[PDB]
Structure 1
Amino acid sequence: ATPHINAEMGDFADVVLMPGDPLRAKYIAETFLEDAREVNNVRGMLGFTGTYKGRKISVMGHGMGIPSCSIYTKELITDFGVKKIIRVGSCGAVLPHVKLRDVVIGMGACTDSKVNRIRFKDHDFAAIADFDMVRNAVDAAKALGIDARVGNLFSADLFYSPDGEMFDVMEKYGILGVEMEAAGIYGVAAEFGAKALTICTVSDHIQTTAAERQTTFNDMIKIALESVLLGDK
């Protein structure tokens, strides 16, 4: 076991899906995985393991913010043999042509955090996803008849920002969605030699009907799961 995960090697699959909400992780396990079992509950951060179409897969929450998800992704990679991390969350949109319920894939992630500068000697480290994982997700989406936008996300440290002018800047440079973790996870993946990807559904435009929104969230999860199978080939 590690400081934040009370499990043992083998308890997790080599691929982990990670929503921010622990209750969302349980929702994913019950809805999409067969023969699922809980493998962690420390601090209430529920994690599970089961199978999808015969493939062993895990899902665990990572909390809100770069500092939080950095702890969990690091531990999974160095102590549980995890090779791939796929964040599945929500984001706010800044571009007008980006519509509610669009599926966004973060090929890269900008940020106002200092963690990567601390890692890269105060220079600019381009926090990017793994190319093959991005490709698998785009292909899985197409196979499901879904339109997926591929571009830059912005990982913010402050959900309630005092600098409102930074949103015009994000829009000017084409940022597709605003969330709070991608840049941190990509930094961890580079530091410890693993692979990561972040996929989001637009929840607000910096909301339609519950039925349609819930349908889109499920499509995102399907895209994640099916992208893994493609990668296996």
Structure 2
Amino acid sequence: HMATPHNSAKVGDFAETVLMCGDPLRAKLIADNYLENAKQVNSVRGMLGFTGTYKGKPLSVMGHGMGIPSISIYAEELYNVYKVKTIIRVGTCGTVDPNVHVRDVCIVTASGTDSNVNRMRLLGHDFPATANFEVVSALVESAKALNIPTQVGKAYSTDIFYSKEQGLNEALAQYHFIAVEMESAGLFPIADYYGARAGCICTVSDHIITHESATPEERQTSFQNMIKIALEATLKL
């Protein structure tokens, strides 16, 4: 008798704060390297999740898979069944904005999308997928204390990684979207539904237009930077 169809953890096995990334093997890397006394609490569908502490405060980390439907399943369950209060997505993104650089960590204030899931929640109208202000502020303040450069602004969550859509990148750049990814627009409205909190921070792994990609060391530095920001933010939340 599993608590959810997608998660073998028992109620209480997840901390009130959860970091989530798309790759479950990355969740394990975070738990093994940054958490104290981490225990694996889920492996259903290989979607590894862990719970331990960071500087004495309980903290969990878990994979969410790729795309809005996948993160919607895991986040709904975490808020509803596991009584999680705060989820921070930590991920990678592409960028179309020339002012955004690979060494920039992107702190997401809101996310647009080409999915229908939010129109369906608000009678077909425009529903902004909006990060919680305390979470954003904790991330901004942590990056400043750590002397890590950031960009703060809008993400765009797409259902199609292999985009064929002409004019999209130009419009995203015109309105200064800083990150293109695939999940955050699904996370924020679920947090709203449960009266809980969510945010998102992403590292830039490539310039979508120029097709220039970040080097392995740039990815290492930005990943460490992002994860240090997120972990410190958890102490304020």
TM-score (norm 1): 0.97
Query: Does residue 193 in structure 1 map to residue 195 in structure 2?
Result: yes
Aligned residue type for 1:217: F
Q: CA deviation at 1:192?
A: 2.1
In the alignment, the residues of structure 1 paired with residue 120 and residue 218 of structure 2 have an alpha-carbon distance, to the nearest angstrom, of: 42
Alignment of 1:172-183 (within 5 A): 172-183=174-185
Asked if the contact 1:102/1:202 (under 8 Å) is kept, the reply is yes
Alignment of 1:109-188 (within 5 A): 109-188=111-190
Deviation string 1:18-51 (CA, Å, 9 cap, x unpaired) is 0100000000001100111100000000000111
In the alignment, the residues of structure 2 paired with residue 211 and residue 165 of structure 1 have an alpha-carbon distance, to the nearest angstrom, of: 32
Aligned residue type for 1:54: G
In the alignment, the residues of structure 2 paired with residue 199 and residue 208 of structure 1 have an alpha-carbon distance, to the nearest angstrom, of: 17
Moved more, 39-48 or 186-195: 186-195
Aligned residue type for 1:230: K
Asked if the contact 2:206/2:214 (under 8 Å) is kept, the reply is no
Unaligned runs of 5+ in 2: none
Structure showing the higher helix proportion among its residues: 1
Q: Which residue of 2 aligns with 1:222?
A: 228
In the alignment, the residues of structure 2 paired with residue 184 and residue 47 of structure 1 have an alpha-carbon distance, to the nearest angstrom, of: 20
In the alignment, the residues of structure 1 paired with residue 181 and residue 215 of structure 2 have an alpha-carbon distance, to the nearest angstrom, of: 22
Query: Does residue 211 in structure 1 map to residue 217 in structure 2?
Result: yes
Q: CA deviation at 1:208?
A: 4.3
Question: What secondary structure sits across from 1:82 in the alignment?
Answer: coil
Asked if the contact 2:153/2:178 (under 8 Å) is kept, the reply is yes
Alignment of 1:11-30 (within 5 A): 11-30=13-32
Question: What secondary structure sits across from 1:116 in the alignment?
Answer: coil
Aligned residue type for 1:227: A
Question: What secondary structure sits across from 2:118 in the alignment?
Answer: helix
Asked if the contact 2:109/2:130 (under 8 Å) is kept, the reply is yes
Q: Say which of 74, 77, 95 aligns to 1:75.
A: 77
In the alignment, the residues of structure 2 paired with residue 46 and residue 10 of structure 1 have an alpha-carbon distance, to the nearest angstrom, of: 16
Q: Please list every run of at least 4 consecutive aligned residues from structure 1 whose deviation after the TM superposition is greater than 6 angstroms.
A: none
TM-score (norm 2): 0.95
How well do the aligned residues superpose, as a CA RMSD in angstroms? 0.9
Asked if the contact 2:205/2:214 (under 8 Å) is kept, the reply is no
In the alignment, the residues of structure 2 paired with residue 220 and residue 161 of structure 1 have an alpha-carbon distance, to the nearest angstrom, of: 26
Identity %: 57
Question: What secondary structure sits across from 1:38 in the alignment?
Answer: strand
In the alignment, the residues of structure 1 paired with residue 104 and residue 34 of structure 2 have an alpha-carbon distance, to the nearest angstrom, of: 21
Question: What secondary structure sits across from 2:120 in the alignment?
Answer: helix
Asked if the contact 1:101/1:203 (under 8 Å) is kept, the reply is no
In the alignment, the residues of structure 2 paired with residue 44 and residue 35 of structure 1 have an alpha-carbon distance, to the nearest angstrom, of: 21
In the alignment, the residues of structure 1 paired with residue 234 and residue 161 of structure 2 have an alpha-carbon distance, to the nearest angstrom, of: 31
Deviation string 1:181-229 (CA, Å, 9 cap, x unpaired) is 0110011111222110010010000034322321210110110110111
Aligned residue type for 2:190: V
Unaligned runs of 5+ in 1: none
Deviation string 1:43-88 (CA, Å, 9 cap, x unpaired) is 0000001111111100000000000000000000000110000000
Say if 1:77 and 1:152 are closer, same or farther in 2 by CA, change over 3 A: same
State the number of aligned residues: 231
Question: What secondary structure sits across from 1:167 in the alignment?
Answer: helix
In the alignment, the residues of structure 2 paired with residue 131 and residue 97 of structure 1 have an alpha-carbon distance, to the nearest angstrom, of: 24
Asked if the contact 2:204/2:214 (under 8 Å) is kept, the reply is no
Question: What secondary structure sits across from 1:115 in the alignment?
Answer: coil
Asked if the contact 2:103/2:149 (under 8 Å) is kept, the reply is no
Aligned residue type for 1:124: D
